[PDB]
Amino acid sequence: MEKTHVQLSLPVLQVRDVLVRGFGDSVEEVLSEARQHLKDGTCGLVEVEKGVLPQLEQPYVFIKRSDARTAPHGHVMVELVAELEGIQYGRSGETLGVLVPHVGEIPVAYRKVLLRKN
Predict the structure, then answer these.
(1) Which terminus of the chain has fewer Cβ atoms in its 10 Å neighbourhood, N or C?
(2) What stretch of H or E contains 99?
(3) Measuring CA to CA, which residue among 86, 16, 96, 28 is closest to residue 62?
């Protein structure tokens, strides 16, 4: 049974390595696909810097920090927020990065998160 939060270690990818640059073609689809790939262990994380988002495909899926005191066991608590045409779907804290499919690219680090399911 699905707990409200799940501990995940996400591979951190450099933007130029990413082969599949988004999760789909609408806000609802990208959130759905991101959640599926997170469950399947096939989701990467790109840290946002200048030039990153223009090299990825909208709609974007961000992981954002969802509280201040609780980083259990080393895993920062996060939730998903999508963006399309400058409008965001969810309100949350600071961005940890943008999620993308992972298809075997070599990461530069792993990021521990405690992900809110829905």
Answers:
(1) N
(2) strand 95-101
(3) 96
* Contact in structure between 23 and 38 (CB atoms under 8 Å): no
Q: How far apart are CA 27 and CA 81, in angstroms?
A: 9
* Token reading at 80: 């998903």
DSSP track, 29-86? HHHHHHHHHHHHT-EEEE---TTSGGGS-SSEEEEEE--SS--GGG-EEEEEEEEETT
Q: Which two tokens stand for residue 90?
A: 């969810």
Give the resolution to one decimal, in Å: 1.0
Best CA proximity match to 81, nearest among 18, 35, 50, 14 = 35
- What the block records as the tokens of 97 is 């990065």
Length of the chain in residues, anyone?
118
The rounded distance, in Å, linking the Cα atoms of 57 and 70 is 32
Domain ranges of the chain: 1-118
